[PDB]
Amino acid sequence: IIITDSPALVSGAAETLRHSTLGLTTGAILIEQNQDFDSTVVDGTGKQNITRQY
Amino acid sequence: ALSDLQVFNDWAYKTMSEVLDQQVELFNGATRGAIILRSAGNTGDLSEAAFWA
Amino acid sequence: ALSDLQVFNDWAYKTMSEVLDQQVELFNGATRGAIILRSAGNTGDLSEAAFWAKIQGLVRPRDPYSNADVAAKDLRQLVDNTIKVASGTPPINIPPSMLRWIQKNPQEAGAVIGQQLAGDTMQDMLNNGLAAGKAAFTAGGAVHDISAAGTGLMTQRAFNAAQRIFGDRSTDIQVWVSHSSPLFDLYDNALANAEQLYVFGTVNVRADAFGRPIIITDSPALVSGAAETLRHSTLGLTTGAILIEQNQDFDSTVVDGTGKQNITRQYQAEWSYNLGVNGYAYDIATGGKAPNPTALATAANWDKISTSIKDTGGVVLVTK
């Protein structure tokens, strides 16, 4: 019984609180990471302080 | 008199940070292959595969 | 030459640009250690320092032929702080186009900005330190106003009256930071009359009758008002009277932009200096003037913890 605190497995609250346990076969869920990461850091000018964002 | 003194208190900044709160090791062997985690990059929004009915 | 030949007036681009127009060389030796420019890293809005307090009556007359009970005494510790003043540079349009047009590199523009800032940065530090100086000295009560007295113009006598506050610390006084205007009025008076008759006129090229050199500067921190309300301020700083701990937190950015005829490039710089210890033991009241000062927060809200006014270093002289 794999255990994880996943929000996808809880809904409702108090009397409406329900829990979903899913039993999987081999290869039931496939996540193919597209290895396509795009990261950038942009700075800014014209403010009391330099503005850097991620 | 300690009261007549100026008490300073150790100040510091931990170099680490909280990263998560949920066990997310649920891939491949972790799920006996139930949830597969591959690094397969594919083109377009859909990767369809037709099979005989 | 002549019309037949062609004259080509030669030309050049000067590497050195105009830096400043105000005397800002008032640091360390230039001011006899009155104002100290130090480089250190300070964390937080300010930096506190706790020094043990002086014990009053620490030495007592002793009688070997007697043994009477002597009152006990306790130790105390005073704490002075050092506020952090932040200064920045507005966006500077530095498009590469203009540089390339006259065959120059944008780097050259960056170097010019840096060489102008070098002087403008020390100017702000000095002006703010001078403003904090008057504020701390007004708060401490070491003020002498001759403006109401007679013409209110500065005289050699004013120096003695101002230094009188520090009885034995009068000699410890290093220089007399003042404005150019009151200095001219001082000499004008002596040059007009009573030179080597009432006052020691032009005792030195620019010093007081006690030898302390007078370092004049066109600092706004030393002029307040106009016409009849115009008043001048002269600081009799002692050694270590002012301390400028320039924090090594200088930052800068080069943000270029598109969407225009030519690449729009800008330059913004930011830095901070722990300006504090405005006197042996003067503590700025950050709680009453916010954590980050804006050169106006001081408002003479500095606190004095020194047991004696002589301990604290620096006196303010106010003249018309």
User: Alpha helices, DSSP H only, in C96-244?
Assistant: 96-101, 106-140, 156-163, 180-192
Which one-letter amino acid corresponds to residue C63? D
* Beta carbons of C289 and C298 less than 8 angstroms apart: yes
The Cα C21–Cα C189 span in angstroms is 26
Question: Among residues C318, C307, C314, which one has the least CA distance to residue C35?
Answer: C314
Interior angle at CA A37, CA A35 and CA A40, nearest 5: 170
Joined together, the tokens standing for residue C14 give 């000067």
User: Phi and psi for A15 in degrees, rounded to 5?
Assistant: -70, -25
User: Alpha helices, DSSP H only, in A1-54?
Assistant: none
In C177-278, beta strands by DSSP E: 223-224, 231-235, 242-246, 251-257, 264-276
Joined together, the tokens standing for residue C61 give 């007359």
Residue C198, Cβ neighbours under 10 Å: how many?
A: 13
B16–chain C nearest CA distance, Å: 19
CB of C266 less than 8 A from some CB of A: yes
The Cα C306–Cα A46 span in angstroms is 43
B10–chain A nearest CA distance, Å: 30
**What are the residues whose beta carbons fall under 8 Å from the beta carbon of C59, sequence distance 6 or more?**
none
CB of C251 less than 8 A from some CB of B: no
**What are the residues whose beta carbons fall under 8 Å from the beta carbon of C33, sequence distance 6 or more?**
C174, C239, C240
From residue A12, give the alpha-carbon distance in Å to each of A9, A17, A19: 11, 4, 9
The Cα C163–Cα C175 span in angstroms is 11
Joined together, the tokens standing for residue C210 give 């006690």
Residue C284 class from Cβ within 10 Å (0-12 exposed, 13-18 middle, 19+ buried)? Answer: buried
* Beta carbons of C89 and C124 less than 8 angstroms apart: no
Resolution in A: 2.9
SS3 state at C265 = strand
Q: How many Cβ pairs closer than 8 A exist between chain A and C?
A: 23
Name the one residue in this structure whose structure tokens are 């033991």.
Answer: C281
The Cα C59–Cα C62 span in angstroms is 9
Q: Enumerate the residues of chain C whose CB falls inside 8 A of the CB of residue A41.
A: none
- Mutation pick from C43, C54, C73, C76 vs chain B, by most beta carbons of B within 10 Å, is C76
Joined together, the tokens standing for residue C256 give 């270029």
From residue C95, give the alpha-carbon distance in Å to each of C16, C88, C150: 20, 21, 57
Name the one residue in this structure whose structure tokens are 């969407």.
Answer: C259
Query: H or E segment at C37?
Result: strand C35-39
DSSP C96-115: HHHHHHTT--HHHHHHHHHH
The Cα C24–Cα C119 span in angstroms is 8
From residue C286, give the alpha-carbon distance in Å to each of C35, C47, C85: 22, 11, 11
**What are the residues whose beta carbons fall under 8 Å from the beta carbon of C208, sequence distance 6 or more?**
C156, C159, C176, C214
B17–chain C nearest CA distance, Å: 20
Beta pairing, strands B35-38 & A29-32: parallel
Question: Among residues C17, C39, C9, C11, which one has the least CA distance to residue C27?
Answer: C39
Which one-letter amino acid corresponds to residue B30? A
SS3 state at C132 = helix
Joined together, the tokens standing for residue B35 give 């949830």
Beta bridge partners of C224: C231
Number of H helices, E strands in chain A: 0, 3
From residue B43, give the alpha-carbon distance in Å to each of A32, A33, B40: 12, 12, 10
Instruction: Name the structure determination technique.
Output: cryo-EM
The Cα C94–Cα C256 span in angstroms is 9
* Beta carbons of C180 and C222 less than 8 angstroms apart: no
From residue C295, give the alpha-carbon distance in Å to each of C62, C85, C133: 52, 8, 11
User: Phi and psi for C288 in degrees, rounded to 5?
Assistant: -90, -5
Question: Among residues C50, C96, C10, which one has the least CA distance to residue B8?
Answer: C50
Beta pairing, strands C251-257 & C264-276: antiparallel
Which one-letter amino acid corresponds to residue C318? V
The Cα C218–Cα C89 span in angstroms is 22
Question: Among residues C303, C318, C320, C306, which one has the least CA distance to residue C162?
Answer: C318
